């Protein structure tokens, strides 16, 4: 059993269980804009409506679920405001009425003032029927950007992979208990169970093709998820009016912000953050874009003794095989993600009258994973 301080759910893992859909009535002016982004963006009315907002206090967001919903609401509004219709006409200043409360709320939750994975995947969902299972057909997102953006497909399939991975996350304490207690058979079983759940998560990943089309993803959704760190469109970053006087750079939404994208590498001692390269740098930097509880969880996993070293030390083929089953499953996940980036970013980019940096990142992550096979 994982400690409650890490905000990991037995059923949905790093996802926020049963996210709030509605804020207090005090925040109706925020909520109307967020719920009407498709129409407000298209009609050129989004920015004016944000500019007409009064500065609202974050004091009436009293609980974590309300604070996370507000982050999702404000984050989606902020991306809509910065990127506009998604045609390259950009806003370089976020007005104070929205920028102040967003930054204040962000500071409170220990997250940067930009839409992150934890917002648009982990807290951006509901069950259609709460008495039916966590499946795509019984689920919907809370917020989208544009009609036809495939935000439902992209966010929900991401979430469903997170949920599939929850089954592996709950075995992590069994792994560390087994090592401490010197329980070889228990450890072997635990590793095999993790490998099984990672294999299951890969099959869930396959659903992306059914709900996302390349053109819409590349030309629309990818634009709204983009940030302002090393972005030539906002080379100095974004001005958060009334919070900082000088523009600040923050990275956009990335798979690297998923805690399951990192935690099994950490568990298995695949030192993805070692060696000094770009990939290692990015993975560490993205921990600050995760909720602090999840950042803290990764820290705790790092601080425990090494599973890899344990298995390596024992002279035990069965244990090595079970460890390698986990490593193999991670390789297959990276390989699949590469195939998706090819179909959804590289090819559309080629047909545009992008993706290589993400491809190179994922190749490095995969290569490092492959090299951890014990054999």
Ligand X SMILES: C[C@H](C(=O)Nc1ccc(F)cc1)[C@]12C[C@](NC(=O)c3cccc(Cl)c3)(C1)C2
Quick one: 53 or 192, whose CB is closer to ligand X? Answer: 192
Give yes or no for a contact between 245 and 375, defined as CB atoms under 8 angstroms apart: no
Quick one: 258 or 364, whose CB is closer to ligand X? Answer: 258
Region from 59-67, 187-195, 290-298, 332-340 binding ligand X, contact rule CB under 6 A: 332-340
Rounded-to-integer distance, Cα 310 and Cα 300, Å: 17
State in angstroms the smallest separation of the CB of 352 from ligand X: 20
∠ CA 329-208-142, nearest 5°, is 115
Which residue in the set 95, 113, 153, 253 belongs to the binding site for ligand X (CB under 6 A)? 253
Which residue in the set 201, 238, 270, 290 belongs to the binding site for ligand X (CB under 6 A)? 201
How many residues make up the chain in this entry?
375
Rounded-to-integer distance, Cα 279 and Cα 264, Å: 16
State in angstroms the smallest separation of the CB of 317 from ligand X: 26
Quick one: 182 or 367, whose CB is closer to ligand X? Answer: 367
Q: Is 255 in the site for ligand X (CB under 6 A)?
A: yes
Which residue's C-beta sits nearest to ligand X?
Answer: 253
Q: Which residues are annotated as a binding site?
A: 337
Which residue in the set 69, 80, 156, 333 belongs to the binding site for ligand X (CB under 6 A)? 333
Quick one: 31 or 165, whose CB is closer to ligand X? Answer: 165
**Count of residues near ligand X by CB under 6 A:** 21
Residue of 112, 119, 103 whose CA lies nearest to 285: 112
Quick one: 58 or 329, whose CB is closer to ligand X? Answer: 329
Exposure string over 186-208, b if 16+ CB within 10 A, otherwise e: ebbebbbbbbbbbbbbbebbebb
Q: What is the dihedral of CA 293, 298, 300, 306, to 10 degrees?
A: 170
Binding to ligand X (CB under 6 A) within 122-161 occurs at: 154, 158, 161
Q: Is 297 in the site for ligand X (CB under 6 A)?
A: no
Task: Tell me the Ramachandran region of residue 115: left when phi exceeds 0, alpha when psi lies from -120 to 50, beta otherwise.
Answer: beta
State in angstroms the smallest separation of the CB of 261 from ligand X: 4
State in angstroms the smallest separation of the CB of 210 from ligand X: 14
Which residue in the set 124, 167, 174, 254 belongs to the binding site for ligand X (CB under 6 A)? 254
Sign, CA torsion 217/219/220/221? positive
Q: Is 264 in the site for ligand X (CB under 6 A)?
A: yes
State in angstroms the smallest separation of the CB of 67 from ligand X: 19
Q: Is 340 in the site for ligand X (CB under 6 A)?
A: yes
Q: In terms of C-beta density within 10 A (0-12 exposed, 13-18 middle, 19 or more buried), how is residue 156 classed?
A: buried
Q: Which residues are annotated as a binding site for heme b?
A: 337
Site string for ligand X, 82-121 (x = CB under 6 A): -----------------------------------x--xx
Q: Is 307 in the site for ligand X (CB under 6 A)?
A: no
For 230, which DSSP code?
Answer: S
Region from 32-40, 129-137, 248-256, 269-277 binding ligand X, contact rule CB under 6 A: 248-256
User: How far lies 43's CA from each of 38, 40, 46, 48, 64, in Å?
Assistant: 9, 5, 8, 11, 34
Binding to ligand X (CB under 6 A) within 210-229 occurs at: 225
Quick one: 7 or 337, whose CB is closer to ligand X? Answer: 337
Residue of 58, 60, 201, 72 whose CA lies nearest to 125: 72
The pair phi, psi for residue 267, each rounded to 5°, is -50, -50
Token pair recorded at residue 217: 């993803």
State in angstroms the smallest separation of the CB of 299 from ligand X: 18
Which residue in the set 106, 124, 144, 258 belongs to the binding site for ligand X (CB under 6 A)? 258
∠ CA 310-336-298, nearest 5°, is 40
Element (DSSP H or E) covering residue 351 = helix 347-351
Residues that bind ligand X (CB under 6 A): 117, 120-121, 154, 158, 161, 165, 198, 201, 205, 225, 253-255, 258, 260-261, 264, 333, 337, 340
């Amino acid at each position: 059993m994982i400690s409650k301080e890490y905000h990991i759910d037995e059923e949905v893992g790093f996802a926020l269980p049963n996210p709030q859909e509605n804020l207090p009535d005090f925040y109706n002016d925020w909520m109307f804009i967020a719920k009407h982004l498709p129409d407000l963006i298209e009609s050129g009315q989004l920015r004016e409506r944000v500019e007409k907002l009064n500065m609202l206090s974050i004091d009436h967001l009293t609980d974590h679920k309300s604070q996370r919903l507000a982050r999702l609401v404000l984050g989606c509004i902020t991306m809509a405001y910065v990127w506009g219709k998604g045609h390259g006409d950009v806003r370089k200043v976020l007005p104070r009425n929205i920028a102040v409360p967003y930054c204040q709320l962000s500071k409170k939750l220990e997250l940067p003032p930009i839409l992150v994975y934890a917002d648009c995947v982990l807290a951006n969902w509901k069950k259609k029927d709460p008495n039916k299972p966590l499946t795509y057909e019984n689920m919907d997102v809370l917020f989208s950007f544009r009609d036809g953006d495939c935000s439902k497909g992209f966010f929900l399939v991401s979430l469903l992979v997170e949920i599939a991975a929850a089954s592996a996350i709950k075995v992590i304490p069994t792994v560390f208990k087994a090592m401490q207690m010197q329980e070889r058979d228990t450890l072997l079983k635990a590793l095999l169970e993790i490998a099984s759940c990672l294999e299951k998560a890969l099959q869930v990943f396959h659903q992306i093709h059914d709900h996302v089309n390349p053109k819409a993803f590349f030309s629309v959704l990818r634009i709204y998820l983009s940030g302002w760190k090393g972005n030539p469109q906002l080379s100095d970053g974004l001005v958060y009016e009334g919070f900082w006087e000088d523009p600040k750079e923050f990275a956009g939404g990335s798979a690297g912000q998923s805690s399951v994208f990192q935690c099994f590498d950490v568990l298995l001692g695949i030192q993805q953050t070692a060696g000094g390269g770009h990939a290692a740098q990015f993975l560490q930097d993205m921990r600050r874009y995760m909720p602090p509880a999840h950042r803290n969880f990764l820290c705790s996993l790092e601080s425990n003794p090494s599973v890899r070293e344990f298995v390596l030390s024992k002279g035990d083929a069965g244990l090595r095989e079970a460890y390698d089953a986990c490593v193999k499953a991670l390789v297959s996940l990276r390989s699949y993600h590469l195939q998706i980036v090819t179909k959804y970013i590289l090819i559309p980019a080629s047909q545009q009258p992008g993706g290589t940096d993400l491809m190179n990142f994922l190749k490095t992550v995969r290569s490092t994973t492959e090299k951890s096979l014990l054999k």
